[PDB]
Design a protein around this ligand. Structure first.
Ligand code: MG
Ligand code: MG
Ligand code: MG
Ligand code: MG
Ligand code: MG
Ligand code: MG
Ligand code: MG
Ligand code: MG
Ligand code: MG
Ligand code: MG
Ligand code: MG
Ligand code: MG
Ligand code: MG
Ligand code: MG
Ligand code: MG
Ligand code: MG
Ligand code: MG
Ligand code: MG
Ligand code: MG
Ligand code: MG
Ligand code: MG
Ligand code: MG
Ligand code: MG
Ligand code: MG
Ligand code: MG
Ligand code: MG
Ligand code: MG
Ligand code: MG
Lengths: 205, 129, 81, 80, 156, 123
RNA sequence: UAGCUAGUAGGUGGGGUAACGGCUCACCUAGGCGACGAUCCCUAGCUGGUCUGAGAGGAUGACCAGCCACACUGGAACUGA
RNA sequence: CCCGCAGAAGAAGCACCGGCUAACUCCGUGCCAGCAGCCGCGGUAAUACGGAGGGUGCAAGCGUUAAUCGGAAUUACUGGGCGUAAAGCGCACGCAGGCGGUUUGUUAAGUCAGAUGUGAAAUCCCCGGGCUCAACCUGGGAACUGCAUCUGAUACUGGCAA
């Protein structure tokens, strides 16, 4: 399924920005990010190791839109694959089609990218994909379809992506509404605010 | 009664190390000499000698580094009550490589690191680390 | 009669046959002796739909193993190459 | 180069037949200890060229009777 | 640069003519992400005073251990009065697999990838000392070569 | 401890005893009520607990607590026990299912509603 | 559950089965199994496998496959490779 | 399977919130009604009962119950104990059995190495491929720790002789 409730509420619960909005305005200008939601907010929660591990896992889950049943399978795949379990999980999450679209800039939000993929406005290697969890392989090409290439939202997404930081492992041509997945993203190419070691220890409890 | 002279030798060495004894004396044996050869080659002891012709006494010179002992752990994996036989594909590795598993192979007595290269297994006499 | 036939496996609406030598008494997807090649009727291009073992099939046809119509058609198709 | 087994003899009271107490060295699957699980058989003894406490070598042949399936080929160490 | 941590806080009860007297005990661990690591146990009528005494006694009486890159050199056991501990190295990525005070002392000791298990009583006071003893009595290739008279390449 | 002793007399796993024997490994069991009454718990608790005596199809005559605030259970009724003991009730170890064949769900309850067999209120 | 077995263990000679064989018969030996558990009681189809467990291990054998038994119950025989 | 029609329209619920375990305030009650897996709560300010608000965990599933394993190193071969928590027969002799000082020679059974046959297929795993991804199917390989035979090695145990 998908989460249809408020997103700034989840951002406040996690204590940091999760990029679930377009980014035209700031977070403080839209909500009280420093105050937890509910009547018992305005006080910093005092959590244990299990609580902080749960928060670390929920932050990634809410950022990427994945649920527990589909995230445990990703963790199992990462553990099965050789190498760092924590880095492989992040690489697999970044390999999702909606995440790739969001990074390229064809969608302002990951939810918008998922909606586009569902509504079949995106094709990979000339073949349309109707799954928001498609695993992208290196040297793949993701291009917008002609039927939806004239979208104000689809161009404002690129206009916000150019303001945002660019991904090194990807390439994009805004004129052609096309992008290329060059290589599998590494740990250094991602954000440093996610401690992936708190997820392996949580799932191996 | 005495039913494990090899274990008796190992316990004598361990007690000498614990009591800071320079030399250890015991009855000699063809297997004890071979085990002392492996120990001397691996450096766990300084030297070994045998004195006599009909009642040979084996003497070992223990090694002490920086005041303490060298042999911190010494066991008897195989015992008369339970014989241990392992192939080359499943030879043990004491202390991940920092220890020695003395192995009696078809060619003689040698460590696990030397037996795996030769590609033969045998009996696992003792663990030293 | 010991015969060479196609045992069906795979998911529904996407069958996958395996050419096996078995007694005619036994069931289709049950007991067999040797497995010789497969067949995917819905296979796309650049994907092998036939990997029969002609040498082994002849080894049984010389001992008395008969050949079904589909097996003969597959043998003819693989020989036409 | 014929598969044969060697073992002691326990009884010779039966007519033209004996029994063999085959002994072996089997390792325990769980505790990894070697034990001695013996096995008894009935062996044909044409001419009665055997005795109690003797070591014999046997061979697997056709079943001579309900409990007979082995025959001897020779006798060694005829200790009294 | 140190990372102090608090493991367990308990409440003891004395007995006098008037009645019961309650005191508080604090167990703390100190580390720097490297071989430096120490433990402290304090007793005081107030929790802040107890933790301050524990930190003061932990900053002193520290110990030195050896790591290969961020893990243990070899599997090792530690034994105390009523606590048994086993801990072995692992590959980079699996993290720390331990429970209670063990995962709190290894984290400040800087060991990032280990597999550990506790057998017997899991009292924090004993398990912390057992882990310290187990980390102390483990050897490095250079240390074992220095006493065996060989080289690291010859030992492997 | 000795290997010879272990070989001679093997190591035996202690048998686990089931605390719910009347169900015969079945999660739910239908039964007929025989006697419904209030019961006095043990120390330190003090209340009146609704307890029914039931006779299952297998022939076991057992006891079952009745949860919820209020019930319509009476003699000659049919209930469905599920399992679960009450510790402050020394002598009963089974719970009943609300919303069963004849058991009625509790009234005016809107929290933990699935456990008491009450329909979703219209809204 | 500490004693069981008299066609019972074996041998000789007939008979019998597609085939060896107390499978059966006539006679002669007093033997045979059993503390490494004979006999007796209760439960249970077996395996490849499945679940859990890092691992040795514990539980189990539904659906897929192989083997065995049965077709209301207890026995019987014919045709038939 | 693909292309047009119109319109957010026809589509979210369950459990929990004292600690174990992530998530708190108010109102009715008063050892009464009641919750419960354990500690336990309730005897007028109950974060533990019932309701409301809010929050947390999952999601077309969510909870409860029954069974197995794990944690249980709580049957401990790997992996435990018997002075005081439970655990040394009241003490001796001794059959079977278990183990056994030292040297040489030989046999080569256990053990060690290699090879052959087999260990069905299906299932686990690895590298890939195809159903719009996945589940699913499928190609090859590894594995099935085993067993039987042969060729040998002789350090240890055992068989034999001195
Ligand atoms: Mg689903
Ligand atoms: Mg304990
Ligand atoms: Mg007769
Ligand atoms: Mg005749
Ligand atoms: Mg006859
Ligand atoms: Mg049955
Ligand atoms: Mg375990
Ligand atoms: Mg079974
Ligand atoms: Mg019927
Ligand atoms: Mg009938
Ligand atoms: Mg006929
Ligand atoms: Mg909490
Ligand atoms: Mg409740
Ligand atoms: Mg109140
Ligand atoms: Mg409530
Ligand atoms: Mg509410
Ligand atoms: Mg266990
Ligand atoms: Mg104990
Ligand atoms: Mg007492
Ligand atoms: Mg006592
Ligand atoms: Mg005494
Ligand atoms: Mg000897
Ligand atoms: Mg041999
Ligand atoms: Mg071999
Ligand atoms: Mg694919
Ligand atoms: Mg197989
Ligand atoms: Mg010898
Ligand atoms: Mg002996």
């Amino acid at each position: 399924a998908r989460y249809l409730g408020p997103k700034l509420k989840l951002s406040r619960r996690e204590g940091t920005d999760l990029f679930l909005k377009s980014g035209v305005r700031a977070i403080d200008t839209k909500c009280k990010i420093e105050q937890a939601p509910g009547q018992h907010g305005a006080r910093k929660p005092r959590l244990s190791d299990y609580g902080v591990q749960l928060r670390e896992k929920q932050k990634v889950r809410r950022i990427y839109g994945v649920l527990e049943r589909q995230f445990r399978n990703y963790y199992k795949e990462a553990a099965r694959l050789k190498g760092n379990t924590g880095e492989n999980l992040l690489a697999l999450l970044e390999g999702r089609l909606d995440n790739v679209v969001y990074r390229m800039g064809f969608g302002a939000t990951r939810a918008e990218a998922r909606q586009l993929v569902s509504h079949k406005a995106i094709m990979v290697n000339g073949r349309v994909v109707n799954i928001a969890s498609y695993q992208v392989s290196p040297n793949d090409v993701v291009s917008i379809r002609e039927k939806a290439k004239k979208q104000s939202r689809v161009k404002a997404a690129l206009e916000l992506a150019e303001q945002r930081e660019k991904p090194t492992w990807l390439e994009v041509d805004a004129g052609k509404m096309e992008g290329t997945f060059k290589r599998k993203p590494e740990r250094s190419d991602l954000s440093a605010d996610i401690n992936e070691h708190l997820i392996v220890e949580l799932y191996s409890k | 009664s005495m039913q494990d002279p090899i274990a008796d030798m190992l316990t004598r060495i361990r007690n000498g190390q614990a009591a800071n004894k320079a030399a250890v004396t015991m009855p000699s044996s063809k297997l004890k000499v071979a085990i002392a050869n492996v120990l001397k080659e691996e450096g766990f002891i300084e030297d070994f000698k045998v004195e006599g012709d009909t009642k040979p006494e084996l003497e070992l010179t223990l090694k002490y580094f920086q005041g303490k002992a060298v042999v911190e752990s010494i066991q008897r994996v195989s015992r008369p009550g339970l014989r241990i036989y392992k192939r080359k594909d499943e030879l043990p590795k004491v202390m991940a490589g920092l220890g020695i598993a003395v192995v009696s192979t078809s060619k003689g007595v040698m460590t696990d690191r030397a037996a795996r290269q030769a590609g033969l297994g045998g009996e696992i006499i003792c663990y030293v680390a | 009669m010991v015969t060479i036939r196609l045992a069906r496996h795979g998911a529904k609406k996407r069958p996958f046959y395996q050419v096996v030598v078995a007694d005619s008494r036994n069931a289709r997807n049950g007991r067999f002796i040797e497995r010789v090649g497969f067949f995917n009727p819905i296979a796309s291009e650049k994907e092998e739909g036939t990997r029969l073992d002609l040498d082994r099939i002849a080894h049984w046809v010389g001992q008395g193993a008969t050949i079904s119509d589909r097996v003969a058609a597959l043998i003819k198709e693989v020989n036409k190459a | 180069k014929i598969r044969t087994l060697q073992g002691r003899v326990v009884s010779d009271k039966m007519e033209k037949s004996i029994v063999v107490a085959i002994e072996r060295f089997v390792k325990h699957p769980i505790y990894g200890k070697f034990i001695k699980r013996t096995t008894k058989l009935h062996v044909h003894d044409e001419n009665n060229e055997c005795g109690i406490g003797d070591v014999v070598e046997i061979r697997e042949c056709r079943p001579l009777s309900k409990t007979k399936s082995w025959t001897l080929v020779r006798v060694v160490e005829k200790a009294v | 640069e140190l990372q102090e941590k608090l493991i367990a806080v308990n409440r003891v009860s004395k007995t006098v003519k008037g009645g019961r007297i309650f005191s508080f005990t604090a167990l703390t661990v100190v580390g720097d992400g490297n071989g430096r690591v120490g433990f402290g146990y304090g007793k005081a009528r107030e929790v802040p005073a107890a933790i301050q005494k524990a930190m003061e006694k932990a900053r002193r009486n520290m110990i030195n251990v050896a790591l290969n890159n961020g893990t243990l050199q070899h599997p090792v056991k530690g034994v105390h009065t009523g606590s048994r501990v086993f801990m072995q190295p692992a590959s980079e990525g699996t993290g720390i697999i331990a429970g209670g005070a063990m995962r709190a002392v290894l984290e400040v000791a800087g060991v990032h990838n280990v597999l550990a298990k506790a057998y017997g009583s899991t009292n924090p006071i004993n398990v912390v000392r057992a882990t310290i003893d187990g980390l102390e009595n483990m050897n490095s290739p250079e240390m074992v070569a220095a006493k065996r008279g060989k080289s690291v390449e010859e030992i492997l | 401890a000795t290997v010879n002793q272990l070989v001679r007399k093997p190591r035996a796993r202690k048998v686990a005893k089931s605390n719910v024997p009347a169900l015969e490994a079945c999660p739910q069991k239908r039964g007929v009520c025989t006697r419904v009454y209030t019961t006095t718990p043990k120390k330190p608790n003090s209340a009146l607990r609704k307890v029914c005596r039931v006779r299952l199809t297998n022939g076991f005559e057992v006891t079952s607590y009745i949860g919820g605030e209020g019930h319509n259970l009476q003699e000659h009724s049919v209930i469905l026990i599920r399992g679960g003991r009450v510790k402050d009730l020394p002598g009963v170890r089974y719970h009943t299912v609300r919303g069963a064949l004849d058991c009625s769900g509790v009234k005016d309850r809107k929290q933990a509603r699935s456990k008491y067999g009450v329909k979703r209120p219209k809204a």
